[PDB]
């Protein structure tokens, strides 16, 4: 639309991932380490 | 919280992979729902509030 | 005359003085006397009104019941905090009057000295005498002996939150 935008970068406030973490066995790195990977939401609750 | 923490070291540490043990009970062997499976956890978190707040107003009103 | 073409001038200065994009000359202007570091002095004498015990006295019903929450440096909730959790995390350390909190009475979350009655509730006399005890010989040499055992922790650039944990 040519209009300056490098002086800023669009963002009025940065957008953090806001997930809270847990300990568990990996089972890739095959070892027990701290993540914030959990199951979808697609599949919670549905079957285990 | 804590003696999860340092069973779970240990065991990582032993070379096995670590167990969590819940308070209330482990699973039911149910194939309806998700909740009926782990009632027994999921009865004993239910009570956090109860458990460790008290029930008399924590402040003072009228003085 | 140039009276009345001066009010006019001030009038029209009126309409556009907060208009926030347009630059004003007095903007960035040279003060009366050269700019030194100044802090706001501290109130010596306070005389509460009744009007003010009695709006304490209200607020002080609206959250006798209130339970509350704060979030750590990686923005996640932590924790039901009735006020004893709150002050034994107080104690501890683990939070400052920097943290976000949230109770009832608010729509966002707050510095915890920006809540109005949070900080007189957590500051008993115990609570004051553990938190300094707990600064001075715990966490203060623990600070100093990482700061000395890791270059990692520039020495021009090093935080001072220890020191004002007993406030
Ligand atoms: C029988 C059970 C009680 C036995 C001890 C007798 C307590 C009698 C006096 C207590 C009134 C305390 C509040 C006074 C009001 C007041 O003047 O506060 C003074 C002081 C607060 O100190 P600040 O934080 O102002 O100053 C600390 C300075 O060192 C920092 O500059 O509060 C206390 O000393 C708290 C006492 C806790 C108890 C200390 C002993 C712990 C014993 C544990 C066993």
Redesign the interface.
């Known amino acids: 639309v040519y209009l300056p935008e490098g002086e800023k970068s669009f963002d009025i406030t940065s957008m953090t991932t806001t997930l809270p973490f847990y300990a568990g066995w990996d089972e890739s790195l095959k070892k027990f380490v701290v993540t914030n990977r959990l199951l979808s939401r697609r599949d919670a609750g549905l079957s285990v | 919280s804590c003696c999860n923490e340092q069973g779970m070291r240990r065991e990582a540490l032993s070379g096995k992979k670590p167990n969590l043990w819940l308070l209330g009970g482990g699973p039911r062997l149910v194939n309806d729902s998700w909740e009926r499976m782990w009632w027994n956890n999921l009865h004993w978190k239910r009570w956090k509030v109860p458990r460790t707040g008290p029930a008399f107003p924590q402040d003072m009103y009228w003085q | 005359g140039t009276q009345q073409e001066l009010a006019q001038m001030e009038a029209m200065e009126l309409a556009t003085l907060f208009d926030m994009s347009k630059p004003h000359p007095l903007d960035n202007a040279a003060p009366a006397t050269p700019w030194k570091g100044e802090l706001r002095p501290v109130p010596r004498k306070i005389v509460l009104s009744p009007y003010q015990y009695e709006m304490i006295?209200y607020q002080?019903?609206l959250?006798?019941?209130?339970?509350w929450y704060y979030r750590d440096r990686?923005?996640?909730p932590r924790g039901?905090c009735?006020?004893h959790?709150v002050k034994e995390a107080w104690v501890s350390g683990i939070v400052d009057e920097n943290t976000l909190f949230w109770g009832h009475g608010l729509y966002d979350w707050l510095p915890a000295k920006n809540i109005k009655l949070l900080l007189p509730?957590v500051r008993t006399p115990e609570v004051r005498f553990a938190t300094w005890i707990k600064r001075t010989f715990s966490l203060k040499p623990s600070l100093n002996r990482i700061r000395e055992q890791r270059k990692e922790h520039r020495d021009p650039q090093e935080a001072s939150l220890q020191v004002e944990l007993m406030r």
């Open positions: 006295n002080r019903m959250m006798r019941k209130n339970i990686m923005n996640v039901p009735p006020l959790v509730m």
